[PDB]
Amino acid sequence: PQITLWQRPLVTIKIGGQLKEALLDTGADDTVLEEMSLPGRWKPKMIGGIGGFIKVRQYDQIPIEICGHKAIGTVLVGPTPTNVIGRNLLTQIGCTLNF
Amino acid sequence: PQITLWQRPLVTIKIGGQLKEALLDTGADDTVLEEMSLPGRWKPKMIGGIGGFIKVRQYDQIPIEICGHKAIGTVLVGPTPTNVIGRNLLTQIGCTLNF
Numbered sequence: 656p657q658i659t660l661w662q663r664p665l666v667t668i669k670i671g672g673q674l675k676e677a678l679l680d681t682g683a684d685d686t687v688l689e690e691m692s693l694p695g696r697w698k699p700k701m702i703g704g705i706g707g708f709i710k711v712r713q714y715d716q717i718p719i720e721i722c723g724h725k726a727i728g729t730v731l732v733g734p735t736p737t738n739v740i741g742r743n744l745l746t747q748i749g750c751t752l753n754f
Numbered sequence: 755p756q757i758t759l760w761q762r763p764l765v766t767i768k769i770g771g772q773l774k775e776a777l778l779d780t781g782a783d784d785t786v787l788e789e790m791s792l793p794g795r796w797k798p799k800m801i802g803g804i805g806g807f808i809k810v811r812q813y814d815q816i817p818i819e820i821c822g823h824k825a826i827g828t829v830l831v832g833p834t835p836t837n838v839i840g841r842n843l844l845t846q847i848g849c850t851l852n853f
């Protein structure tokens with residue numbers, strides 16, 4: 656679908672059996688979600704953005720569904736102020752910027 | 755053009771007659787650039803990012819070219835890890851998300 660940017664591009668995502676609202680962010684390298692439980696192994700990671708860095712848990716090969724489009728990839732979980740879907744997953748659903 | 759997201763959506767922008775590299779960020783409400791000089795008076799603004807808040811200088815009605823597309827809008831100047839072009843300007847150049 657074509658998403659305009661007049662408003663924040665928020666979408667519903669299905670992950671870990673849960674439904675969450677997340678921001679499609681082309682400027683984000685990774686996908687980071689607020690505290691939640693995910694299965695499998697994980698490793699600590701520090702990610703930075705405006706304001707500095709925050710520590711998160713990195714889970715790889717996590718199944719995810721965005722706007723009906725299924726994909727799998729790395730999901731970071733930590734004290735992020737808002738849920739963000741990064742390029743690592745945007746690519747998988749064939750998302751592109753156009754103008 | 756159509757920009758894929760396998761790599762960071764970095765583009766060349768021109769502001770104050772100088773060329774700079776910036777990231778097209780759909781997850782940003784505003785446009786924030788690294789320290790630089792701009793004409794006129796500025797207003798204070800506190801913006802929040804993944805790592806927390808920072809104080810920035812707000813300049814309005816600033817001419818800025820993005821990938822050749824002409825825009826004139828608000829530009830925030832402050833301690834940002836990278837130059838980011840937010841929705842306020844992405845909308846001026848007709849940018850949309852597609853998948």
Ligand SMILES: CNC(=O)[C@@H](NC(=O)[C@@](O)(CCCN(Cc1ccc(-c2ccccc2)cc1)NC(=O)[C@@H](NC(=O)OC)C(C)(C)C)Cc1ccccc1)C(C)(C)C
Binds near residue numbers: 783835
């Ligand atoms: C290598 N790091 C990254 O790729 C990281 N990227 C970012 O932080 C970037 O993509 C913006 C990611 C979206 N985020 C989402 C966000 C939304 C709301 C809040 C917030 C604010 C106050 C209170 C509660 C929440 C925090 C973050 N939005 C903002 O931070 C913007 N904020 C905004 O639109 O909010 C007014 C800003 C104007 C400050 C730029 C900006 C960035 C790009 C490239 C290099 C360094 C940084 C990472 C989070 C994916 C690891």
